[PDB]
Design a protein around this ligand. Structure first.
Ligand SMILES: COC(=O)c1ccc(O)cc1
Ligand SMILES: COC(=O)c1ccc(O)cc1
Ligand SMILES: COC(=O)c1ccc(O)cc1
Ligand SMILES: [Zn+2]
Ligand SMILES: [Zn+2]
Ligand SMILES: [Zn+2]
Ligand SMILES: [Zn+2]
Ligand SMILES: [Zn+2]
Ligand SMILES: [Zn+2]
Ligand SMILES: [Zn+2]
Ligand SMILES: [Zn+2]
Lengths: 21, 28, 27, 21, 28, 21, 27, 21, 28, 21, 27, 21
């Protein structure tokens, strides 16, 4: 879940890439 | 690297993915 | 001059969809 | 396509609702 | 449907109202 | 008040229409 | 290419006005 | 009009202050 | 006059400074 | 620090000018 | 129609830089 | 310049990383 990675926790720009198509 | 929620998270995804597109699925 | 382009499109999608979520894929 | 349609011409929030999960 | 404050609320009003215009009166 | 409807509480897009001119 | 159009106008209004509030009406 | 003025030509935040309540 | 953090603070600086440019140094 | 002036505390538009180049 | 102009540029800078901070100066 | 480059032509987030402190 992107929310638990990056909203509820802190995440990187490469972690955000996981959710690109 | 960054705390991002809601519309800011989505704008961040747009910037990083761009042409590739993305999916925002907050519930799962 | 126009309306929902780039960044503004995905902001409008978040508003309309919200917790449902959404997919974004240009052509 | 909607992304091109919204930027090239008119878009309603109703039309954008099709892209919600 | 959505929790919206400050500048996000205003952008939401712009999107929904558009040509009609709107009034943002947070105090009353 | 829009704030108590939609900031302090949760509100819909039709509730936001109430504040269009 | 220019400056305060559409979404950006109402964001600038919120900044300038804030708790005072503001009216937005195009022609 | 200010909305058209800001988008068509230059706008100062001082000019935008006229539209505060 | 306003409570501003993160990306909103930066957008505010852009609006007020504009052509002059600005520096965002949150740590010091 | 701009953060302590305007994020952690409340600040004015003339206070934001201090951080223009 | 293009990409990172004006307001969107400084938002992308904040994302990329964040707590590091950044300088913004046009020509 | 980067500000003009990003608006006039293509910009990567990698190129924008040069302007971090
Ligand atoms: C700050 O630059 C990056 O590390 C970066 C990471 C992922 C991208 O897609 C682009 C840039
Ligand atoms: C998601 O679509 C709507 O329900 C909607 C409501 C009010 C509008 O003005 C536009 C769309
Ligand atoms: C609301 O108008 C101002 O007071 C203002 C202050 C600083 C500026 O740079 C511009 C406008
Ligand atoms: Zn925000
Ligand atoms: Zn926007
Ligand atoms: Zn926005
Ligand atoms: Zn903006
Ligand atoms: Zn924009
Ligand atoms: Zn914004
Ligand atoms: Zn943006
Ligand atoms: Zn934004």
């Amino acid at each position: 879940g992107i929310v638990e990675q990056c909203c509820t926790s802190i995440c990187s720009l490469y972690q955000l890439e996981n959710y690109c198509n | 690297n960054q705390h991002l929620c809601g519309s800011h998270l989505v704008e961040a995804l747009y910037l990083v993915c761009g042409e590739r597109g993305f999916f925002y699925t907050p519930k799962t």
